[PDB]
Design a protein around this ligand. Structure first.
Ligand SMILES: O[C@@H]1[C@@H](O)[C@H](O[C@@H]2CO[C@@H](O[C@@H]3CO[C@@H](O)[C@H](O)[C@H]3O)[C@H](O)[C@H]2O)OC[C@H]1O
Length: 189
């Protein structure tokens, strides 16, 4: 179990962040495994992957994901210049993060169609401090907790639609939660 922060564990970069409300425990396991256990948590994001990520990585993930409330399971990362927070959402809890968002297209990859959206965060925390930035999303129609994600298919589709990414920062398989409960155990490669 660890303190919020970043680093490396068993060859994999990890990032764990939370708002301090309590109620969430993040654990680094062997190889690319990590677990999250939460009960009436605040806001939090944690997972394993790479720093920096790439625009053509094939990411494999497998495990269990059991949210009770607002939570996402995604390939998650950021780019710099432009600053972008992105998500390839494989599963979620009570809230589809694209609710009310502008649909920017569709892309088929790894066994399902995904809907594409762009949203904006205004004066919110980021990898470079408080800022206004866009978020790119690919939301999988066929929910799952294991699989393979060919990131290039998503990044290329986004670029085609005008959702350009800058230089890649971190890229991980992450469990995100917003004032919810749940458990998850995920292995990344
Ligand atoms: O110490 C600094 C860290 O706190 C900083 O971390 C990033 C903060 O922004 C996080 O992004 C939010 C995650 O939740 C989404 O729902 C929101 O839109 C984001 O604002 C990100 O996960 C953290 O990596 O990194 C820089 C450090 O110096």
């Amino acid at each position: 179990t660890i303190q919020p922060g970043t680093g490396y564990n068993n060859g994999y970069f990890y990032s764990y962040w939370n708002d301090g409300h309590g109620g969430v425990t993040y654990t680094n396991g062997p190889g690319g495994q990590f677990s999250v256990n939460w009960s009436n948590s605040g806001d939090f994001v944690g997972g394993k992957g790479w720093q920096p990520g790439t625009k053509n990585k094939v990411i494999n993930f497998s495990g269990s994901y059991n949210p009770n409330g607002n939570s996402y399971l995604s390939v998650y990362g950021w780019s710099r210049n432009p600053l972008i927070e992105y998500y390839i959402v494989e599963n979620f809890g009570t809230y589809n993060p694209s609710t009310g968002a502008t649909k920017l297209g569709e892309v088929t990859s790894d066994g399902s169609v995904y809907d594409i959206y762009r949203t904006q965060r205004v004066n919110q925390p980021s990898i470079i401090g408080t800022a206004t930035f866009y978020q790119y999303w690919s939301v999988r129609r066929n929910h799952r907790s294991s699989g393979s994600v060919n990131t290039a298919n998503h990044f290329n589709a986004w670029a085609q639609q005008g959702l350009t990414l800058g230089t890649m920062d971190y890229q991980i398989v992450a469990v995100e939660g917003y004032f919810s409960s749940g458990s998850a155990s995920i292995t990344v490669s």
